[PDB]
Amino acid sequence: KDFDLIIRNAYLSEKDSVYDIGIVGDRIIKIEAKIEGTVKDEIDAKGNLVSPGFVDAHTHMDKSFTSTGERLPKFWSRPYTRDAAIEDGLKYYKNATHEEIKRHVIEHAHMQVLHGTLYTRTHVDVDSVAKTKAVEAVLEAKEELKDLIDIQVVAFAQSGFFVDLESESLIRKSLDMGCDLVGGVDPATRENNVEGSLDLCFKLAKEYDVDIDYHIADIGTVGVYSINRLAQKTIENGYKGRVTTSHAWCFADAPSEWLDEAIPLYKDSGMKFVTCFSSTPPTMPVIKLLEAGINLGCASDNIRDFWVPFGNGDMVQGALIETQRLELKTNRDLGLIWKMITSEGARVLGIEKNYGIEVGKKADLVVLNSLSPQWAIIDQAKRLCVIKNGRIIVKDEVIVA
Amino acid sequence: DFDLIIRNAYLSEKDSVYDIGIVGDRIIKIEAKIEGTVKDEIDAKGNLVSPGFVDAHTHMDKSFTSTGERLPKFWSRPYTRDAAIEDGLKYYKNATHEEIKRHVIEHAHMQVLHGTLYTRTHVDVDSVAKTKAVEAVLEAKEELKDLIDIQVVAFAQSGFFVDLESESLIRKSLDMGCDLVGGVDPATRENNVEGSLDLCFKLAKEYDVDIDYHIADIGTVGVYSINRLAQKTIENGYKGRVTTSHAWCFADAPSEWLDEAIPLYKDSGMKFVTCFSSTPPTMPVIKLLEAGINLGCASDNIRDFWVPFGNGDMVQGALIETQRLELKTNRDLGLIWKMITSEGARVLGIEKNYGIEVGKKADLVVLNSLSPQWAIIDQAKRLCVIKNGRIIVKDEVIVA
Ligand SMILES: [Cl-]
Ligand SMILES: [Cl-]
Ligand SMILES: [Zn+2]
Ligand SMILES: [Zn+2]
């Protein structure tokens, strides 16, 4: 048969028209208004949007769903602070077993693929209590999940390199076990040492030739200062394009001139950013960042744990959440958010060359029940079909892999 | 014996699981186990059963006018009140009775699918819509009465002192049977705060109806406008009969302005509605509720030239509010749940017949989640909706 799979009547946003999509193995082979030829399996999109797989650029699969199990969410009789949530992890990771972490990771993944997410980058706690236990469970589950979702794994020193002094050796080990990236947390208010926390991160990154994804959630000028130091060291170390800053809440409350002055530094350093829809500050200058050409992806962050009680692993729900946080309504703006959950996330992850609905690219696709990006955000219809490596893995809200 | 029993229903106010027995349109028995079987039963399977959600502010008449193309119509340009007013005037020129009616019913069906059984809609009354939109809404309201209770506000969307035909058209609308009267922005729309408000109260007293005013003006001008409204509420003997919609101004006005006004609002019995399509992120929602202010919640417009969004789903709206307002604790999520239920009931005036208690209306929603908190978080679809003791929704289908 000429194609292994054809998608019929697929509206493609980037072309603003309806096409048949022909697939062989794990690749898109043909995109034509009508495809002639024999074919093994077919899906009719019926004039609706077909999209590349959504990118969830920042998750914590390892400690997800730990809030579940009772009538009320566990942990949430008290308000969120970073330091208190760090203490809850340490206590949780004391008795947590390999298999239950694994189970949580797989559950998290299944929930994501059900919503059309086919690429994620997760961080995993590495500290003196979790040790490499959580890393091992994640890497193992990642192996089992490879026909459903691509996972990048950040060795994440959640307690601080200069607070928990066992962090440096545990991370080295985690990187040797095969984690893809390295990152720490809040150089200023967590580490109390900006130059040293950052220099150490770059040293470890260069030793194992891995990219970097840093949690910088500190607000105000202290946050912008921290990100500036990071971007400057990015250049000094020859790591242009290899560094991501997660959160960057500080862009919301720091004076706007601080960001205006830093933008050229961010472009020069190839600095990439991820805003999580469970925390994007309402005054975050998201539109402004994108119009200035900054690479800004989007993400669930934590899901149903002791940091964040929320989460459905659904980036289309997350897109709606961002329109509301940021008070957007125009079709153009809703389109920029759609880019955030797709092609911007691809760039953050480094996979842009194989990403998109174009001849030659990976047959990783989502058939939606809505007419357009805008309409999908608005109506929140469930996914009709999910396709990974040219194979149907989701149909009718069931994982059929 | 019972016309209907709901089995294994978790009830939040009691924090326990119960069977619920219903006869006609009333709840008759709430017991841990109800002895005997009946023809019509629903098993909630340990999940939350809730009173019907209240969507305290909608515009059913002009809903879904954005639909019909690949991209939402109207939204190639940004929102301003005045521009959206002009779009309505143009839309209402050629709009027919039946098309408005169709939109109203569609809106209602969408709402009941999500467990909303009570709504208050505003309907445009001005020199182009005239009473055409009122007539279509009232008619559809009559057809929908087995699905959802509707209150209808005669709403002078263009301004009493801007469109001078408004006063007579509203009087007519009220005589046709609209339940409430309201205007818009006494300051930046009417350019006359004392007169726009005094006229609204005159019309209200002529027809003995309650009031629901759109005050979206920001800052001190908004708070000042609401203060004048609350003060006239007292002067006119209308304590408890006045609702202020939006009140965005509580978000940006200095906090001391609100602190000083709160006793006035309590004295006047002022009621408020925040719409989840616009609640400002710094709106002091929690603070209002802890001070004992009655604050309901609402979709506002749905897929029109004011708001492109909307699914008429208050549980989705509750999630939206947690994100706008940055709430996470179980207590705070519980206050939002109150906003979409019992607070809305109070705004609408129906609290005596509202709740899952013996004696109250058998208007209920069987959810697929364990608790208010878990429902907000997981957004599971509704299992069953019951209105006047009859099943009207099952497995996402309207079965009435
Ligand atoms: Cl330093
Ligand atoms: Cl005045
Ligand atoms: Zn994180
Ligand atoms: Zn309104």
Author numbering:
A (entry chain A): 3 to 403
B (entry chain B): 4 to 403
Sentences from the paper on this structure:
Trp309 has been shown to be motile in the comparison of the ligand-free AtzC structure and the inhibitor-bound structure, suggesting that this amino acid moves upon substrate binding.
AtzC is a tetramer, according to PISA, our SEC data (native molecular mass of ~210 kDa), and previous reports, with the asymmetric unit containing half of the tetrameric structure. The second and larger domain which contains the active site is a TIM-barrel fold. The active sites of the independently solved structures show similar architectures, each having three histidine residues coordinated to the zinc ion (His60, His62, His217; 2.1 to 2.3 Å) as well as Asp303 (about 2.4 Å) and a water (2.0 to 2.1 Å) bound to the zinc.
